[PDB]
Amino acid sequence: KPGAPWWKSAVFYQVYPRSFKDTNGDGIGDFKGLTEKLDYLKGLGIDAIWINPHYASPNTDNGYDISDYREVMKEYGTMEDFDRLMAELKKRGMRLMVDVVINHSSDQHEWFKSSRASKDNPYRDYYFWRDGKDGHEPNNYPSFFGGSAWEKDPVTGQYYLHYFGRQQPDLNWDTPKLREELYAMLRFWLDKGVSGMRFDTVATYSKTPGFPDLTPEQMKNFAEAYTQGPNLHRYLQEMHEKVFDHYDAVTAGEIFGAPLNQVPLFIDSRRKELDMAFTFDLIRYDRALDRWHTIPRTLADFRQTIDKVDAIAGEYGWNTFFLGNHDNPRAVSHFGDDRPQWREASAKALATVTLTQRGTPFIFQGDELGMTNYPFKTLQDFDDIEVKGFFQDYVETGKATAEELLTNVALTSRDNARTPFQWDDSANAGFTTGKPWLKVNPNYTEINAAREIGDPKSVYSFYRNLISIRHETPALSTGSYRDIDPSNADVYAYTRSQDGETYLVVVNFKAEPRSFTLPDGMHIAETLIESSSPAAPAAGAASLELQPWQSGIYKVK
């Protein structure tokens, strides 16, 4: 003692409700579906669930465009269903983390309908309204979802700001009354017993006074420029002081776009801002600036990025660790090898990495099954507004052909992570009895929960066993982290240590046999678990012979 907070040793599971489990045949997942599957998650060993936005929403961005912060999304159920989900999680000693989207609201939110009525409306300053310049928009800000970040509203002739979709106007945190409304809203959910909140694009809350144009340089990486608002930390510290200081909920911020060196300002516990951070340096380590092309990287880049992110946590900060989420391609497809002969092996290898990283691991729904990217055939197979945005910015402008967009976005699209969870091999993998909102991956015939749960050699069983091991081994949670050799592009090896106990994690990222020599003086003591291994090393081993994609966790001496 002091002991570590429950969130530092917990294993979280991210549920994208819309695609988890449908119970009424409309093809959309819902609260009753998630509730019916809590035993599944409890059995896997999950301590807490983070659910994507579940509030009233027109769904132009699947929940991230909120029209009423105190009502549940019609598609997911009623408040009664949300309350029941809460109660069932508690009966199982599980915690719930909800998504908080307060960088912007839906343009259907009552605040916006009011704001847009006139320049003198009491809600005018709840958003950003500005006069155009030189015949066009206020400045050159681009939107993440296509075109300008400024939309003209003829009702007043001014433009309103939207970093994301035109139906997601940005909230004006410079307005005290708006901040107070957001705080009351957070208390509304916190009073219901919510255990955590994940703050969507938490680094963009502060806008730059005067909205000057982005420089040519900033334009190439506008995501970073939007995180440089001068009042950001003041706002975060105020929110902590006014809200979180009065509850025992964990806060996690999605720091997208921010330079890694600034992350400590968000998570250093002494600053009283956020408890932990979701960074994207790793998950986007091979993504081009335009966000739809990929750039070839090696394990050397992968581990060096992890090393830099871990270092940033220092002694008072804390990181979450994830290899996938609802905005990125599937982990095994992105970091592993999803070819049939290597999918399971690499998926287990990635699981070992995830569950042995320093920080709070988040498992995205389906990754415990080894789900893969989807085989998109036409641009119409994508539902995502972001893909429509790339079409607008790159195809309609003649920068790329529709075929080039398809070829590339098929590998990076958010829709890859949004296909229905594959429960079994019944119609539409047991996700729905109706027509799914997004097509189920045809590989559900071999990749599904029912098939993996009863098989000791499945990806699921491996995740389950890793989660047990993590729970029983303190060092694998809060222990220190040290990369054995940052320049090695074949075998990822590192140690986790705490209170004199040290563990070695070794993962072969190559589809070929490789060798690993332990550091001078270090020797294998015991083997906790291995995947794709014919035999464990013998006690005292000073080196290991690795099979393709083999992974293992060992106690060393």
Ligand SMILES: OC[C@H]1NC[C@H](O)[C@@H](O)[C@@H]1O
């Ligand atoms: O809200 C905008 C953007 N924020 C980040 C979320 O992960 C993503 O799904 C959403 O579209």
Ligand SMILES: [Ca+2]
């Ligand atoms: Ca439904």
